[PDB]
Amino acid sequence: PDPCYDEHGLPRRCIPDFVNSAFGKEVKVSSTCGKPPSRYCVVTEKGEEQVRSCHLCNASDPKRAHPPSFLTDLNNPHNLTCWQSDSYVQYPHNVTLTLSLGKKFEVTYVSLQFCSPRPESMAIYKSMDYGKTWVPFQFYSTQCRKMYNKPSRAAITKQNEQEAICTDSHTDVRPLSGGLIAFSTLDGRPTAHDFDNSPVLQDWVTATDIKVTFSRLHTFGDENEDDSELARDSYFYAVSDLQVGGRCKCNGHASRCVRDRDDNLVCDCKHNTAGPECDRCKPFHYDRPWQRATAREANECVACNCNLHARRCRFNMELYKLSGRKSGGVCLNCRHNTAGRHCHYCKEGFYRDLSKPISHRKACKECDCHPVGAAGQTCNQTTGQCPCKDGVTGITCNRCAKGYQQSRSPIAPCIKIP
Amino acid sequence: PDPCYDEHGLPRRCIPDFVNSAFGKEVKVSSTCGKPPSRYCVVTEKGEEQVRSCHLCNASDPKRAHPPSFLTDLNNPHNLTCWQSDSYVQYPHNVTLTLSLGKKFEVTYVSLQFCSPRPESMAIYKSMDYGKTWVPFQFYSTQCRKMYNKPSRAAITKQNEQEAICTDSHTDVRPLSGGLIAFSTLDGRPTAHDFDNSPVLQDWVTATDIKVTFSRLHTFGDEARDSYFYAVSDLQVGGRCKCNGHASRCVRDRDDNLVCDCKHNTAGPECDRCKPFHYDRPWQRATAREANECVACNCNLHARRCRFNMELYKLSGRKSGGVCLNCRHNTAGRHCHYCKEGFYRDLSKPISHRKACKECDCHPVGAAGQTCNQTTGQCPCKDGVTGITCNRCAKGYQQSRSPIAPCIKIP
Ligand SMILES: O=S(=O)(O)OC[C@H]1O[C@@](COS(=O)(=O)O)(O[C@H]2O[C@H](COS(=O)(=O)O)[C@@H](OS(=O)(=O)O)[C@H](OS(=O)(=O)O)[C@H]2OS(=O)(=O)O)[C@@H](OS(=O)(=O)O)[C@@H]1OS(=O)(=O)O
Ligand SMILES: *[C@@H]1O[C@H](CO)[C@@H](O[C@@H]2O[C@H](CO)[C@@H](O[C@@H]3O[C@H](CO)[C@@H](O)[C@H](O)[C@@H]3O)[C@H](O)[C@H]2NC(C)=O)[C@H](O)[C@H]1NC(C)=O
Ligand SMILES: *[C@@H]1O[C@H](CO)[C@@H](O[C@@H]2O[C@H](CO)[C@@H](O)[C@H](O)[C@H]2NC(C)=O)[C@H](O)[C@H]1NC(C)=O
Ligand SMILES: *[C@@H]1O[C@H](CO)[C@@H](O[C@@H]2O[C@H](CO)[C@@H](O)[C@H](O)[C@H]2NC(C)=O)[C@H](O)[C@H]1NC(C)=O
Ligand SMILES: *[C@@H]1O[C@H](CO)[C@@H](O[C@@H]2O[C@H](CO)[C@@H](O)[C@H](O)[C@H]2NC(C)=O)[C@H](O)[C@H]1NC(C)=O
Ligand SMILES: *[C@@H]1O[C@H](CO)[C@@H](O[C@@H]2O[C@H](CO)[C@@H](O)[C@H](O)[C@H]2NC(C)=O)[C@H](O)[C@H]1NC(C)=O
Ligand SMILES: *[C@@H]1O[C@H](CO)[C@@H](O[C@@H]2O[C@H](CO)[C@@H](O)[C@H](O)[C@H]2NC(C)=O)[C@H](O)[C@H]1NC(C)=O
Ligand SMILES: *[C@@H]1O[C@H](CO)[C@@H](O[C@@H]2O[C@H](CO)[C@@H](O)[C@H](O)[C@H]2NC(C)=O)[C@H](O)[C@H]1NC(C)=O
Ligand SMILES: *[C@@H]1O[C@H](CO)[C@@H](O[C@@H]2O[C@H](CO)[C@@H](O)[C@H](O)[C@H]2NC(C)=O)[C@H](O)[C@H]1NC(C)=O
Ligand SMILES: [Ca+2]
Ligand SMILES: [Ca+2]
Ligand SMILES: [Cl-]
Ligand code: NA
């Protein structure tokens, strides 16, 4: 059926599946070996000795070429997809990785599996928009204050839950190969248990781009020396899999994200909502403002009540809060000769045809006063009583009253009688 | 002071004095002795013999020149001033005397004094226009059928009271000097005792000019020295100036015309119509006990023109019938008594006041329409809005901003 609705047809909060938003995605890096072709040294241990090896990184040979595509391809522990940068991009220089998702995702984690020694200092940034503004998100480094000007392992308080935490944890050389770095956005967040009812954390987890900056790099004594190896050296960055798990952000009003008219990813919004993340909500559904989907309530925009007359409408906060936070939408351009907040009364020049229901389109008969016996041509919108002149009476003014006699005058049709 | 209104100022029927409309006025003649000066001859009597004479008539000598002026001048039984015609003007020749009065009188009598012997056949005509059409008014002759083709001494039917009658009374030669012929406009006339309620007779006596035609002259003697002429001492047409009972004097106009001092809110030459805006009741001739005045229209000081509808008058019980035209001052109705659509009666001012009808000052937010009640001025309020102009929220309703929904009900 539809996960956004129950078996009785009422709406319930729905959420897309959890996936790696980076699988198969293209990646943009500021470094990669191949142009020109160079060598790289890899130290592999065997019992106790080490003895480093040497290999060549061929830009053309698929069998010695490390393209950024290996970051988001199918990772296989028995046969890795290593991406290697250039040679000795040491501080202050830094290799940056930028991933564009083309859709607001609620990030749950960001993991980098390095087939070489993990970085001494890396930075993980996000983008709230679609690549214009970046925001700190996690930091790793042996000298937090010295390099990222962050205090080591800051205290996370409700006063500032979006703190970018720097840590000297996970920033160790060995394992010289296959080291992980996994950043969980909700770990240690004060209000992470009450996420649906914490907007600060919803903003904290939402992002459309992920930047990864590799600031410093681990080294040993081999740096100046003399045999520094001016053509390749063995210090470098290298990651075999880059994962960024999470969910497509739909504020709980979409079971799944689909492909746009222009191939862009967007929520298949339900509950009468619209917009890429089901933030706003469909036309004519503007009674009661838009809220996020919660486990307790579905909170879908409700349509305006216009007694089946007007089509457009529009939400009003004051009317909403002044009606007990129940109805705040007013109707627009009432058709069928009506008017008012809900198209509930007939406009001047017409009256309420009570014989027919207010929802009916003929619920507003015109005035139809009498050209001779009526003093005006604008009847009572409530009763349809035309203003009768002197001797004339009725609702349409087409007859004389008691003590008054009919006449052939257009001006004085009835006249009293003594 | 004015006889058209009593002490209380109530209008009572009034009439101009009874005068001789001929005195002074000039008569138009056709035959006057004097042209190539000739002579005549009057004849007297001595009991048996017919002693006659013969005198001269000059066209210049004051002491011998019988002019037409001698018909309407100061007349006295002594030193009598006589008009005379050229001698020998017997059948079928005519001697006419027209008199234009200038305005419609109600002729009462037509008198003639005859220095010569009275005529054998004479006729009195009149005009109710001004010399254009001339109708027969009385005939005098011995041979009526023969000459005027009128039945001698017929009867005045109520069906034809405007009938000229020929008669042989006053047609004798009896008085050679001083013959009187007088025509009473209402002799023989059936409804004469009810003149004041007899429109036929009122039309009959109305006349603007008068023509006396002399026809056959009495050859008296039977013996040349024929000398048979017409000679009238004084012509007296006595009557009142026709003002239909709404005037006490006739006076001279802004164009120098004899007309009526039309009172009783009437207008016109003979007070035959109502004055402007005094069209509430149909015009009638003043009666003794009635005075049928012209009554103005009550447009409560809001209209300049009035028009009369007889249908309205009759269904009104013969009361009013005047419909006002162009009700100004933002009013409408027969008598400009109610405020047209978009205005309302300000009952603080009086109906006659210019600002008796104010406008609709209906709040554009609190009102569902922009038309007052006209009687109350209240204007179509919407939902939780009260006030004549829909300017305030009601009880239990709270002000907002939204013009579509000004007031909203509280918890
Ligand atoms: O209807 S018109 O606009 O064409 O006016 C026609 C002429 O009437 C005058 C006065 O004429 S006068 O007798 O020679 O003094 O103005 C008057 O017209 C109407 C009422 O008379 S009506 O003929 O029944 O229409 C009034 O206007 S309204 O209230 O009906 O809207 C005038 O009042 S006002 O001047 O608008 O204040 C009324 O004049 S008043 O009330 O006596 O003061 C002439 O106007 S005038 O210039 O004051 O003399 C009109 O001729 S004109 O071309 O406007 O001059
Ligand atoms: C190495 O690390 C830094 C930060 O992690 C990466 O961002 C670079 O940082 C510097 C400032 O430290 C930026 O310099 C600025 O450039 C603009 C001109 O566009 C100028 O207006 C500023 O006054 C300032 O000088 C620098 O722009 C920024 N690098 C880029 C490409 O924007 C840096 O990218 C890392 N190195 C590499 C190769 O990625
Ligand atoms: C590995 O790299 C070498 C060169 O760095 C490639 O050998 C030749 O490279 C030149 C370009 O500089 C080409 O013009 C030749 O065609 C290459 N020789 C060939 C294709 O036989 C070498 O091709 C690369 N490995 C593979 C599989 O192509
Ligand atoms: C791991 O991948 C390598 C190569 O990607 C496999 O060795 C073969 O290498 C040649 C290169 O010319 C490829 O054409 C072959 O496709 C590779 N063999 C196979 C079965 O794919 C190596 O076998 C792979 N090891 C495992 C356990 O899958
Ligand atoms: C009849 O008509 C004229 C007007 O009177 C007379 O002419 C008069 O002739 C006398 C004789 O010389 C003159 O003295 C007068 O000048 C004329 N009269 C006037 C008034 O001017 C004519 O004679 C008259 N016949 C008689 C008898 O009076
Ligand atoms: C009639 O008016 C005339 C106007 O002149 C007058 O005629 C005079 O009559 C008397 C005798 O009656 C004579 O003595 C005179 O000669 C006439 N001439 C004048 C100049 O007076 C007179 O006033 C009146 N005549 C009569 C009879 O009353
Ligand atoms: C007799 O009076 C008759 C009419 O009563 C006169 O005849 C009319 O005279 C006027 C002249 O002003 C003409 O306009 C009319 O056309 C005449 N009537 C007809 C029917 O022709 C007449 O002048 C008098 N007759 C005589 C002989 O003197
Ligand atoms: C305009 O106001 C008058 C008077 O207020 C209306 O006439 C009556 O008003 C009372 C209330 O004031 C009502 O209860 C009656 O129903 C009204 N009619 C009668 C016969 O009493 C008048 O109807 C109002 N104008 C319009 C268009 O309804
Ligand atoms: C249309 O009809 C209704 C009922 O007659 C009018 O509303 C009432 O009008 C009277 C006026 O005397 C008030 O006393 C009542 O308080 C009104 N009812 C309510 C619930 O307030 C209405 O005014 C009429 N429309 C117009 C323009 O007069
Ligand atoms: Ca991989
Ligand atoms: Ca005289
Ligand atoms: Cl007749
Ligand atoms: Na080295």
Numbering used by the authors:
A (entry chain A): 40 to 457
B (entry chain B): 40 to 262, 270 to 457
Please share excerpts from the published article on this structure.
Netrin-1 (NET1) is a chemotropic guidance cue pivotal to vertebrate development, where it plays a key role in attraction and repulsion of axons, cell migration, regulation of cell survival, and cellular differentiation. It is secreted by axonal target cells and functions as both a short and long-range bifunctional guidance protein for axonal growth cones. The dependence receptors deleted in colorectal cancer (DCC) and its paralogue neogenin (NEO1) are crucial for NET1-mediated axon attraction, cell-cell adhesion, and tissue organisation. Heparan sulphate proteoglycans (HSPGs) such as glypican are cell surface receptors that modulate NET1 signalling by acting as attachment points and modulators to fine-tune axonal responses.
To investigate the structural basis of GAG recognition by NET1ΔC, we performed crystallographic studies in combination with site-directed mutagenesis and MD simulations. Our crystal structure reveal an antiparallel NET1ΔC dimer in the asymmetric unit in complex with one sucrose-octasulfate molecule bound per monomer. Our findings assign the LE-2 subdomain of NET1 as the major GAG binding epitope. The laminin-type EGF-like fold of NET1 (LE-2) is highly electropositive in nature (IEP: 9.64), and is characterised by a cluster of arginine and lysine side chains that spans along all four loop segments. The GAG-binding epitope forms a linear extended structure which includes the Cardin-Weintraub motif RRXR (amino acid residues 350 − 352) from the loop ab segment, and the R374 - H375, H399 - R400 tandem of the loop cd pocket. Overall, the positively charged recognition surface area covers over 1085 Å2, offering extended recognition sites for acidic ligands. Remarkably, both SOS moieties, named SOSab and SOScd, showed interaction plasticity and span a distance of ~26 Å across NET1ΔC. The combined loop abcd mutant did not bind at all, validating the observed NET1ΔC-GAG interface. In summary, NET1 provides a remarkably extended GAG recognition surface by combining relatively short, widely spaced basic amino acid residue fragments to generate an extended high-affinity GAG-binding site. Both the Cardin-Weintraub motif and the RH-HR tandem motif contribute to NET1-mediated GAG interactions.
